[PDB]
Amino acid sequence: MDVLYSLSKTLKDARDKIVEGTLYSNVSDLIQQFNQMIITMNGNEFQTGGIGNLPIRNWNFNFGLLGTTLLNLDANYVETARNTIDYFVDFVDNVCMDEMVRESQRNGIAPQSDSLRKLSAIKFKRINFDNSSEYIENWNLQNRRQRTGFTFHKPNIFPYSASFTLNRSQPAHDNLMGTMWLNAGSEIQVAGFDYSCAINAPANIQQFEHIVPLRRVLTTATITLLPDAERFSFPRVINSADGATTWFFNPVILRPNNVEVEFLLNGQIINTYQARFGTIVARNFDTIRLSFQLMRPPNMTPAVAVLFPNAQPFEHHATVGLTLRIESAVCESVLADASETLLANVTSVRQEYAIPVGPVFPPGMNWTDLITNYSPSREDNLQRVFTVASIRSMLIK
Amino acid sequence: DAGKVVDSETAAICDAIFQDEETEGAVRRFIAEMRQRVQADRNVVNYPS
Ligand SMILES: [Zn+2]
């Protein structure tokens, strides 16, 4: 695993530094690495593929060393090295696709393919080169039990969920109370409603609350908070809880009163913010607790006072909502986000070669089903496959 | 530079490795660069063999 990154690092540098006309002292230490790759790899033989429609290929290495005697590199020296690099870079593609496609349930952090088990001998350890990427540095710190961290831009921490809750209801569905929400990606939009507009509430104030637990602990997040849910603002018809009938929701929107956002960790309040919108921070949390309340306005112009009567026909329903959005955070387990394409490389290999459903991952690599039940057996497999997908992205985009 | 080996035969062996046209570049370049460490205090020395 450490020597699979070390093969790809000095094939990336060999296509970049060994160019025509360059001075020899620019590449004097790469050629000592590239010649010492070849000496270790000669005489061995490998075999990749076999699962699904992934074809079986056999690999055999018998190459010669590079020359170490020029002052400026010429077109003979480049063209005799390109037909050696192009055989290794085809070998690393078929080892990385052989490993992203396999999985185990007992110990997923171990290598699973036949070729990567063979590269983990002490014979092949002399190919080891620097480990400077983000995923190979966190592969080594976490293997010694030291603290790691991945930096994300808009991480997919929330599974998709769109539902509601009725705290007061009747079969006519004309005097209701409760909340509605959408949790999707890295964004929460909750909105509380009350049809009577707190005409009989004590002190004309109705209290709402919405609690979102996370799956993993986030660290040093940057969060944007805005006092409107724009998705629950228009008239719509909504089905009932069991799909029997439908009910109508015609909102008018007040401002949210007495907003309190809390950031919990094992039930302890780490941060809190009271009527403070814009950008906020959250240093360590795993549970977000939103709290906001509706207050009936005590003074109303004649255009407003017609909307909220005392009797039963309520044609304009009051609505109070919020909107939360995580911009960037630092987690310790691997996730998906909006910047890098490591999830897209894993699913595209499995979909292309028609791979059967195994014992660990959900069918079709569904991210909503995978972050919902994000077991420690799935975490060790998901890190092992995102790390191999990161090695393949250096050579083959 | 001023480098040493541990006795008289390991200097006769490593000289013949330096001469013949079969040894690789990382080994021939190395035996002109391997170093002893004297460390006069604590009385601990290190010599290649
Ligand atoms: Zn962006």
Automatic annotation (TrEMBL), chain A:
Its main location: virion. Ca(2+) binds at residues 266, 286. It is found in: Virion. Zn(2+) binds at residue 153. GO terms for cellular component: T=13 icosahedral viral capsid; viral envelope; viral intermediate capsid. It holds the Pfam family Rota_Capsid_VP6. GO terms for molecular function: host cell surface receptor binding; metal ion binding; structural molecule activity. Keywords: Calcium, Capsid protein, Intermediate capsid protein, Metal-binding, Ubl conjugation, Virion, Zinc. InterPro entries: Capsid_hemagglutn (IPR008980), Rotavirus_A/C_VP6 (IPR001385), Virus_capsid_a-hlx_vir (IPR008935). Residues 62-73 are annotated as: Interaction with the inner capsid protein VP2. One of its GO terms (biological process) is fusion of virus membrane with host plasma membrane. Sumoylated with SUMO1 and SUMO2. Sumoylation of viral proteins seems to have a positive role on viral replication. The N-terminus is blocked. Homotrimer. Interacts with the inner capsid protein VP2. Interacts with the outer capsid glycoprotein VP7. Interacts with the outer capsid protein VP5*. Belongs to the rotavirus VP6 family. The VP6 trimer contains a zinc ion located at the center of the molecule. The zinc ion is not essential for either trimerization or transcription activity of the DLP. Zinc-depleted VP6 has an increased sensitivity to proteases. Intermediate capsid protein that self assembles to form an icosahedral capsid with a T=13 symmetry, which consists of 230 trimers of VP6, with channels at each of its five-fold vertices. This capsid constitutes the middle concentric layer of the viral mature particle. The innermost VP2 capsid and the intermediate VP6 capsid remain intact following cell entry to protect the dsRNA from degradation and to prevent unfavorable antiviral responses in the host cell during all the replication cycle of the virus. This is Intermediate capsid protein VP6. The gene is VP6.
UniProtKB/TrEMBL annotation, chain B:
Sumoylated with SUMO1 and SUMO2. Sumoylation of viral proteins seems to have a positive role on viral replication. The record marks 26, 30, 34 as: Interaction with the intermediate capsid protein VP6. It is found in: Virion. It comes from the Viruses. Belongs to the rotavirus VP2 family. The N-terminus binds RNA. It is necessary for encapsidation of VP1 and VP3. The N-termini of 10 VP2 molecules form a cylindrical hub underneath each 5-fold axis of the inner capsid. Homodecamer; each decamer is made up of two conformers of VP2, called VP2A and VP2B. Interacts with a VP1-VP3 complex. Interacts with the intermediate capsid protein VP6. Interacts with NSP5. Interacts (via N-terminus) with NSP2. Inner capsid protein that self-assembles to form an icosahedral capsid with a T=2 symmetry, which consists of 120 copies of VP2, with channels at each of its five-fold vertices. This capsid constitutes the innermost concentric layer of the viral mature particle. It encapsidates the polymerase VP1, the capping enzyme VP3 and the genomic dsRNA, thereby defining the core. This is Inner capsid protein VP2. It comes from Rotavirus A.
